Write a protein that binds this ligand. Structure first.
Ligand SMILES: Nc1nc2c(ncn2[C@H]2C[C@H](O)[C@@H](COP(=O)(O)OP(=O)(O)OP(=O)(O)O)O2)c(=O)[nH]1
Ligand SMILES: [Mg+2]
Ligand SMILES: [Mg+2]
Length: 572
DNA sequence: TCACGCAGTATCCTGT
RNA sequence: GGAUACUGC
């Protein structure tokens, strides 16, 4: 009955299904003695809000202070009588909680007795600035469902979760092989000290052509390399790909050179030749559904690959577009938006790895084009197929097979680059340290990681976190140099983790320094206890130090050494 | 729906 | 005065 599964990604739709979080991952099946994809739907993640009592009753901010002391009973009565009826809230459960607070909202004391209201997510949402007669502020009005789930259940990054008393599904809700429904969030718990399971990986490369009339890109070839046991905590497997599949479609005008049959017959049986782009897209979707990859990797996947894939699927009305993702949906996500959030939603439940973003984050190169990346990482030369020659290649079997093999080689290069940098294990480590979702980590950026790190740190220590938002100061000192040439030994003395060590030493934190809503605040007293930000910083620093010790091991492999270096950099 | 800070060097342009 | 780059920590 107890469902033990490893979770990799989480998807929520704030507008369609309120209070539902779709976790995806892997579960172990003895009948097949293997790992299969699973989708668990956590339901009824009730909204939680915190009301801050006033010190003296105020006549709806009209008569100002009245002098009547306020207790939690007064706040509960005010919420039950006025607010609930006004905002159409039917049923709710309220309690009292003593919580601390130190952030950028004035008049909020350090430690106060808040009233915690828990009510379903189907009801309307209270306004942020809602002020009554006994409470002066409301916190948590717009908190998301996924954030509430992760913070309440103390879930940090991919891990093993146990579910007590799972329930089946009345109708299918996902393209996975195993499904379960949790009627409460308290039924999910995290089990520590277990190894990560293998995860399938699919590296895909597309070759297209721009039809001038429509100025729209048309797909003519796709190649994919698939590994069914890619590890998340060990070195990449050699070779980096187990199986492969290639699909090639004739253009809307040109025809094969009356020898493609013999060419494919004599080459191999893994190449699928289709006549219309609709068939190509359908076969690709079916193959993706059958393989069921947890990680899909590519170059410019967010920018060009997935966007063109979805555009062509919409244009060709290819049935079952939702196969591209892991959740069965009827309306396609709107095409557009910043970065690739629309593309991410289209592939909900499947981690997407763009080697461009990871290369930008991890290493430094003059250009992040695929050719330059292959030159700098794999140390190999990649041939380039001119855009104007792909169309003309539909005149001989040899040229068409060469084009398909070029796509295959591009896919292999992408997979090799992914393996070299340890993109996946490093992403897992960073996600576990921070506590965000893996797809967010692999989409790039730094703000989300620290945001979730501090969110977890504060929630664990009984704090009320801020509400999500809806050369400004002096920096370092650069001494004036004595420019010239020096032919004698120059000794460079550098501080170790300067700013983190400053935060630790002087105890700089939200709960220590006394801010006032552009002057430098005074240093905190030395009689206090270490805050949250210092402690977290210390943890990170120690991690880095340990990695450095590993780097110091004598007689270590070069490549591994380099990997360690990268890790160090990341942590720093 | 997004996005780490600041200090510093190098190059180039200002019509209707 | 502005604009465009990318090094350093
Ligand atoms: N916000 C921010 N600050 C940085 C970054 N890189 C360096 N700094 C700042 C904060 C560091 O404490 C300070 C000192 O630079 P260093 O390169 O010597 O790093 P640090 O001393 O922290 O560690 P290390 O000497 O490499 O062991 O410069 C950065 O990428 N972002
Ligand atoms: Mg330093
Ligand atoms: Mg000036």
């Amino acid at each position: 009955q107890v469902f033990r599964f490893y979770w990799l990604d989480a998807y929520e739709d704030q507008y369609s299904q309120p209070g539902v979080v779709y976790l995806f991952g892997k579960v172990w099946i003895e009948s097949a003695d293997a790992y299969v994809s699973c989708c668990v739907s956590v339901k009824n993640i009730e909204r939680t809000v915190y009301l801050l009592p006033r010190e003296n009753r105020v006549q709806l901010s009209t008569g100002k202070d009245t002098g009547a002391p306020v207790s939690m009973m007064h706040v509960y009565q005010e919420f039950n009588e006025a607010v609930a009826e006004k905002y159409k809230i039917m049923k709710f459960k309220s309690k009292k909680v003593d919580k601390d607070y130190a952030f950028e909202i004035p008049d909020v004391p350090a430690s106060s007795e808040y009233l915690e209201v828990r009510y379903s997510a189907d009801s309307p949402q209270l306004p942020q600035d809602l002020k009554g007669e006994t409470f002066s502020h409301v916190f948590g009005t717009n908190t998301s469902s996924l954030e509430l789930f992760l913070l309440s259940r103390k879930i940090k990054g991919p891990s093993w979760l146990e579910i007590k008393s799972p329930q089946l599904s009345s109708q299918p809700m996902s393209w996975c092989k195993v499904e379960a429904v949790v009627t409460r969030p308290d039924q999910v718990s995290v089990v520590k000290d277990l190894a990560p399971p293998p995860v399938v990986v699919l590296s895909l490369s597309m070759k297209t052509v721009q039809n001038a009339k429509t100025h729209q890109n048309e797909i003519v070839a796709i190649a994919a390399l698939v590994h069914h046991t890619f590890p998340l905590d060990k070195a990449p497997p050699q070779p980096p790909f187990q199986t492969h599949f290639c699909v090639l479609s004739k253009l809307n005008d040109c025809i094969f050179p009356y020898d493609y049959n013999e060419a494919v017959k004599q080459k191999n049986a893994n190449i699928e030749i289709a006549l219309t782009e609709r068939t190509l897209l359908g076969f690709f979707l079916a193959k993706i559904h059958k393989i069921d990859p947890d990680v899909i990797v590519g170059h410019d996947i967010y920018g060009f690959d997935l966007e063109v894939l979805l555009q062509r699927i919409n244009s060709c009305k290819v049935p079952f577009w939702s196969k591209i993702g892991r959740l069965r949906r009827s309306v396609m996500p709107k095409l557009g938006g910043r970065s690739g959030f629309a593309e991410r939603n289209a592939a909900c439940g499947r981690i997407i790895c763009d080697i461009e973003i990871s290369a930008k984050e991890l290493i430094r190169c003059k250009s992040y084009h695929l050719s330059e990346l292959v030159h700098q990482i794999l140390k190999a030369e990649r041939v380039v197929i001119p855009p104007e020659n792909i169309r003309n290649a539909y005149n001989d079997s040899v040229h068409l097979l060469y084009m398909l093999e070029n796509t295959w080689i591009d896919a292999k290069f992408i997979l090799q680059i992914m393996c070299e940098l340890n993109v996946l294990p490093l992403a897992l480590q960073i996600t576990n340290i921070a506590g965000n979702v893996m797809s967010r980590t692999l989409m790039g950026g730094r703000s989300e990681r620290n945001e979730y790190l501090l969110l977890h740190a504060f929630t664990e220590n009984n704090f009320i976190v801020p509400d999500k938002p809806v050369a400004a100061y002096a920096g370092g000192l650069v001494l004036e140099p004595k420019v010239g040439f020096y032919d004698k030994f120059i000794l460079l003395l550098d501080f170790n983790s300067l700013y983190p060590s400053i935060i630790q030493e002087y105890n700089i934190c939200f709960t220590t320094v006394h801010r006032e809503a552009d002057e430098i605040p005074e240093l905190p007293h030395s009689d206090l206890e270490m805050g949250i930000l210092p402690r977290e910083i210390r943890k990170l620093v120690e991690r880095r130090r340990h990695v450095k010790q590993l780097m110091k091991q004598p007689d270590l492999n070069p490549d591994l050494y380099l990997q360690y270096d990268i890790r160090q950099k990341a942590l720093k």
